[PDB]
Design a protein around this ligand. Structure first.
Ligand SMILES: [Zn+2]
Ligand SMILES: [Zn+2]
Lengths: 111, 49
């Protein structure tokens, strides 16, 4: 997660303080240079799961098309929950489900 | 007899569906989990008919 400039409001890019060997972050517009917290500089993923539980809203109980199941709510023992499968849309994704209770709005699963 | 056979095949398809949803289906070579699920269901229903 890359930050932005406290002065110029642009984005900070990595750099090296060769006289201290500490990863700074250099503004390509201004001369401001702040200390950073995380020495990680890059990431790449192929086995991702972002979009697993993100497909839920507060008023998802108001959707009248979601099928309703009799699974017990682990939270409040509620015998009425709407359910749906993984909102990730890849080809190899599971068919495992997600379960949303209409009482506490806590999401749960059957595992 | 015909309606019993059709009901038995519907139960078989529902069992395949349960197995796929609880992650218990056996994949096939050169074939995805979803393509395996669809192939097994199509096999069951063709044999039902
Ligand atoms: Zn800057
Ligand atoms: Zn609940």
């Amino acid at each position: 997660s890359f930050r932005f400039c406290l002065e110029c409001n642009n984005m900070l890019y990595p750099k090296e303080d060769k006289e201290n060997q500490r990863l700074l972050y250099s503004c390509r517009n201004c001369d401001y240079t702040e200390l950073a917290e995380d020495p990680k500089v890059y990431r790449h993923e192929l086995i991702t799961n972002i979009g697993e539980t993100a497909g839920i809203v507060d008023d998802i109980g108001q959707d009248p098309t979601l099928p309703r199941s009799d699974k017990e709510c682990p939270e409040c023992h509620s015998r009425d929950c709407v359910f749906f499968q993984s909102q990730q849309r890849r080809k190899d994704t599971n068919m495992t489900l997600f379960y949303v209770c209409l009482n506490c709005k806590k999401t749960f699963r059957d595992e | 007899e015909i309606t019993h056979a059709i009901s038995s095949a519907k139960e078989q398809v529902q069992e395949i569906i349960y197995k796929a949803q609880h992650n218990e289906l056996e994949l096939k070579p050169g074939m995805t989990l979803r393509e395996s699920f669809e192939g097994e269901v199509s096999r069951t229903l063709n044999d039902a008919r």
